[PDB]
Amino acid sequence: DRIIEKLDHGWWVVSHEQKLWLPKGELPYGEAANFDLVGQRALQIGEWQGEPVWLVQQQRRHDMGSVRQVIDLDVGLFQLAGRGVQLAEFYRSHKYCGYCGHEMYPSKTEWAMLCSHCRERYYPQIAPCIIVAIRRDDSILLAQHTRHRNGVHTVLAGFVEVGETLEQAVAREVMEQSGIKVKNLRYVTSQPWPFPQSLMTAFMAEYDSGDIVIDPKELLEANWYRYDDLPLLPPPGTVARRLIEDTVAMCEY
């Protein structure tokens, strides 16, 4: 944490209310003076290839928008842009102490908010979330979502509840949304997803039993699609798409 000088440089995440400043559609890069940031306060949130990544908690007049717009960057830098967006919301969300009502102040030694009155504190909230590609022989279960409305057929996802494992969360979400039981559950990777603050844990699984019965609150439609006859898919750069490619590349025939 520090006040920005003229000869500070790097990547500047100027963020407020889940948006960040992307003039010309790009993450600002360069010297502080080129963005009128001298004298402002910033937290260094990481480093990319020799360059500090800076979080400035500030609203600009124009070009504020979604961090999704810089998802074409190297994954490592896009994760760091998302860190800034999530940190600015973390601070905004703990202006007051939840236990106490009293105003909070930020730690100097880590990402945390401390109460001026209570002994209590908070750290940023990461929301663990499962996402699973279910295979049935030569086919993959794909579904359209009620709250999306986008023509994309994708795999099944949901937030982990308190007191449950990732494995229980997969079995519970698959059952609730689609009525099927799965076997041979297998972890493959994870992915920070700042929309607003999820951590994806990505799984493959195999069909075991049951018939597709939908919860219409979550799914408009679900079905088994043969690996070479697929519909429209979620974009590259999501673990969902990678899970579907891996499952296709598996189908061995």
Place this chain on the structure above:
Amino acid sequence: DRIIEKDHGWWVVSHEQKLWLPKGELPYGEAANFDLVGQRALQIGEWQGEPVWLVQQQRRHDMGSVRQVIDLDVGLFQLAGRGVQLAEFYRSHKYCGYCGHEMYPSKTEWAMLCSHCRERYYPQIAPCIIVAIRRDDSILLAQHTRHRNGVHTVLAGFVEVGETLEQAVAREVMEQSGIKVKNLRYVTSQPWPFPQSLMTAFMAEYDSGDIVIDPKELLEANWYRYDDLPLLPPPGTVARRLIEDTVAM
């Protein structure tokens, strides 16, 4: 979520990160046994065809940690952990952190809602890595500065915002021990309500580096041969599960 009547099952009576443990054990039976009739409860799960209830209440005697009841079956201990964490979730959002007004709970999910500014919160689960680092016939085991109890265990740390589980493993191992690892394999996960972690358990393999410990986290660390292990964390912890899987090789 409603008022309790003379109702049955497992009772998680929790205030300020403790629950009521008469005789050291979880209360089980009808509401009248425990002077609970007319109080407010939330059903938080089901165990062997019987409800598990959370009552947000302080008792005068025998309040304790959920750790006392870890000898229960994993599935029930998970539910008692849920009640403790749920009670602390509600207490931690009496007030809205955005605008400062009092919140009120959702009736359709576990959530706290703000009438005044229309933001909400869900229960915080803190993802946390734990990893058994294997080197041929050997496993990395460390003594912790926090507990100081003769127990040699594996390495663990909280995942950061913006990082993967894989980067969190590599980072925590590097910061605590100085070694670089490879061949990360996921094994399992486990809720750990102390106060609110979700452990994601990994195996890794020694790639390179020498052991140089952070004396603010570790007192000591070394490579132990799989059949000549020091005192290990108690069975039933996820740390013990990790070590026993790597011993089995």
